[PDB]
């Protein structure tokens, strides 16, 4: 599963989640993409689940681009503890994801293969999504 190999600091303060995505809003590599409509902390498990779903639909074929990376350490205290006594341990990693971000792209595949694969992937995601196709607006960026 994805996660940083090394890190300066083990624990980050919690995000804010305002504003449209900072970058990565245009299709950059493949033909079709999957776009976030709402903000969220997308976990590494969600990503890995959306990715495998698109592989088993492409039956090992095509290309898959994952343009979000879970770099934000996610912390949780052990069950039933009281508050305080310092920050909980790192239990996972999320990628901050805001409306307009292209999270995944595909190519090497028919339009029907890609639209379905991207549809299945969005069901693995804790947010609403939208499938896009590489336009000239994309190539002008």
């Amino acid at each position: 599963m994805l996660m940083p190999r090394r890190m300066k600091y083990r624990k980050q303060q919690r995000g804010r989640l305002k504003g449209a995505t900072k970058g990565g809003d245009y299709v950059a590599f493949g033909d079709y993409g999957l776009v976030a409509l709402e903000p969220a902390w997308i976990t590494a498990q969600q990503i890995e689940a959306a990715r495998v779903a698109m592989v088993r639909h492409f039956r090992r074929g095509g290309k898959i681009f994952i343009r979000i990376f879970p770099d934000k350490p996610y912390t949780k205290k052990p069950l039933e503890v009281r508050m305080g006594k310092g920050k909980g341990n790192v239990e996972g990693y999320v990628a901050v994801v805001k409306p307009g971000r292209v999270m995944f792209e595909v190519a090497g595949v028919t339009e029907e293969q890609a639209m379905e694969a991207l549809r299945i992937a969005g069901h693995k995601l804790p947010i609403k999504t939208k499938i896009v196709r590489r336009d000239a607006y994309d190539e002008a960026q």
Partner: peptide, 9 residues
């Protein structure tokens, strides 16, 4: 039940 707690360094 009161679960024991560690501490911050």
């Amino acid at each position: 039940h009161k679960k024991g707690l560690g501490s911050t360094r």
